[PDB]
Paper text:
The otopetrin (OTOP) proteins were recently characterized as extracellular proton-activated proton channels. Several recent OTOP channel structures demonstrated that the channels form a dimer with each subunit adopting a double-barrel architecture. In this study, we performed structural and functional characterization of the Caenorhabditis elegans OTOP8 (CeOTOP8) and mouse [name] ([name]) and illuminated a set of conformational changes related to the proton-conducting process in OTOP. Combining the structural information from both channels, we propose a working model describing the multi-step conformational changes during the proton conducting process.
Residue numbers in the entry:
A (entry chain B), B (entry chain A): 27 to 86, 97 to 157, 164 to 195, 238 to 269, 288 to 314, 320 to 354, 361 to 429, 487 to 563
């Protein structure tokens, strides 16, 4: 009853959808997508109709602030992909099912209505069930999108990545936040300069080799920047912690702590999978050494940055405050540049040749499509938390 | 800090173990088990050493009652399998690694110490971390055991099923319960007769065809009993609910409700996977019709029994109480007989020929090994809840 009644509906609805998505994709007789698209369209239709009904009856603690920006950005990218899908599937209809053209139209409506509904965020019991059903709708969409990339391998621009995984993650987090609240009662000129330099070098590395085989030098450049970037934050964040050593009536920021370590778990899994794939696999060559160092540095960077940020938030000589400004700002700028790759780069990175060979394309694509989008969550929260730290001290 | 510090350790430890288990088993270069066994032995060793240290320092709200009985029963079955493993791997050592014989010895010690530790259940912070680490230890063991069955296909009795999946489920549930409590501040002679008759018929069906190809008649007998058994409870439980219609200052039994629907999710997934495998797959033959009816009846039986039990618990003519006694007792006896198959029958049921062909042996074995052990949880709680209902009214 009440809150638990809505939760039980969601898991039962999610379990039903997940079985149909997984069963229809991982069976041996044939691969079914029209049924899966028919399923997703039905869930989106009901979810949109509850939201539309909710908006009309309402038009008469909020969680992270970066959540709304990510939802709109990834919602727009989904809309562009949904607009391109209707344009392509409308040129020919004689050789394609109706569900394949009706699905993008419904998805575009669902994204538009849900994004507006979440942006501006009685039967509190109906509201909870409707929110829980929509949360399961996005998680059902998230699983189908993840499965789609795994099973793989006029405009005609099919290269457009459907940002369904990222949009569903942002929507599901925002839907849960709303549901929980239903019925609630100077500068040393060393860090900023270095941080800006890595931002430009990192931005160039994304455009040249990450937007879309490649060359040996291109692979070394990507690893060289990442190793330098991750290594510098690990040293800088470690420096930040030892400064706190040479120096309480507030409560623990459980949400901030949980988000930092929780969202870092995605990159931990990527690193853990990478390490085994190099220890066994790559024949101790240059790429393996670079892969091993990059994977270890991600673990180290995430660990030490999280320690520095968590201690900095809870506490709340002139150089001490001055040095902490560049340390926070250098970590902020480096976190921003490392956010673009998990956000707009091809999930199976061209640098993951060793990983793809070890696990297979389908398994590795599943791993990155599940784990990398959580890196997005981590980078925004790291930037937002570092912004508060820099503003604070 | 505090409770969250222990939780964060567990997920980080569990994620590390899960990646090594999944990475070492689902890669293409080679399958690694000695490393996985070496990993599990290390986790069990530390978990056992914390428990041993905990017992010495302590020897100077409890959740379901059936939990302890399931832990001891499945712990004993694991010990018999661990005893048989040492006996087999000690006859020859010239052609097998040392980790393969050291693992059962450590596992037997871990099971013995953990079962005793959980049966009798300061540094509250150390205690929480130790409990969380052991909880992740059992979940790491649970995942490795599930993966072992999927990748498949003197005494010499290797047929002995390692009840690692079931024991780990019971241990992890008991470990979480303890962790949460750390630092806490007549008869109509119609149902019993019918229930007993189905118990004998069901018990015979388990011995004849379920302990261990088979015959067509054997398959029909298994479906005939299950369809009759599941159909009867659906009618009986529905009868029980309509009786409540022809007739509040207590709180909702959230744990009892969550356990009923939560544990029923495993059979829901089995049924959902079964239905698709018959709708597409089996060529509308006798087995498909029996499979379809059995899968649907499991969904119906679980749904209506849960509704009847949940309403019965919350509320707390002479025939009205008399009829409810046989209805509760008939459901109790039928729940007991349907508990033995998910508990001691071969996970890939001989009746799942259609399912195995549709999904493949590896995928279906993974599905049943994940979902069926939760049916155990459901059956015990259904029996325990029905026992309270029969005692109450």
């Amino acid at each position: 009853g009440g809150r638990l009644l809505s939760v039980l509906l969601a898991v039962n609805v999610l379990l039903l959808a997940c079985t149909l998505i997984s069963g229809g994709a991982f069976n041996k007789v044939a691969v079914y997508d029209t049924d899966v698209f028919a399923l997703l369209t039905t869930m989106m239709l009901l979810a949109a109709l509850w939201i539309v009904f909710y908006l009309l009856r309402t038009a008469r603690h909020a969680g992270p602030i970066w959540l709304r920006g990510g939802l709109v950005l990834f919602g727009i990218c989904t809309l562009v992909m949904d607009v391109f899908k209707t344009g392509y599937y409308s040129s020919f209809f004689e050789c394609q099912s109706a569900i394949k053209i009706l699905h993008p139209i419904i998805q575009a409506v669902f994204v538009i209505v849900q994004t507006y509904f979440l942006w501006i965020s009685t039967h509190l019991d109906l509201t909870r069930c409707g929110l829980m059903f929509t949360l399961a709708t996005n998680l059902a969409i998230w699983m189908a999108a993840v499965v789609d990339e795994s099973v793989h391998q006029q405009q005609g621009y099919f290269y457009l990545y459907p940002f369904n995984i990222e949009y569903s993650l942002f929507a599901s987090t925002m839907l849960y936040v709303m549901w929980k609240n239903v019925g609630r009662l100077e500068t040393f000129f060393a860090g900023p300069v270095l941080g800006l330099l890595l931002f430009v070098v990192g931005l160039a590395v994304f455009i040249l080799y990450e937007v879309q085989g490649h060359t040996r030098q291109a692979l070394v450049i990507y690893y060289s920047f990442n190793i330098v970037c991750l290594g510098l934050m690990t040293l800088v964040s470690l420096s930040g912690s030892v400064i706190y050593r040479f120096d309480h009536k507030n409560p623990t920021r459980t949400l901030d702590v949980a988000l930092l370590m929780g969202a870092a778990l995605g990159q931990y899994a990527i690193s853990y999978y990478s390490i085994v794939a190099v220890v066994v696999g790559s024949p101790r060559d240059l790429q393996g050494a670079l892969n091993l160092s990059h994977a270890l540095l991600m673990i180290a960077q995430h660990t030490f940055q999280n320690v520095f940020i968590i201690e900095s938030l809870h506490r709340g000589c002139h150089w001490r405050r001055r040095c902490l400004k560049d340390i926070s700002l250098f970590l902020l700028l480096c976190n921003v540049i490392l956010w673009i790759m998990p956000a707009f780069g091809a999930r199976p990175h061209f640098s993951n040749t060793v990983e793809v060979d070890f696990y297979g394309y389908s398994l590795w694509a599943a791993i990155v499509n599940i784990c990398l989008p959580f890196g997005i969550f981590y980078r925004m929260h790291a930037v937002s938390s570092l912004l508060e730290v820099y503003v604070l001290s």
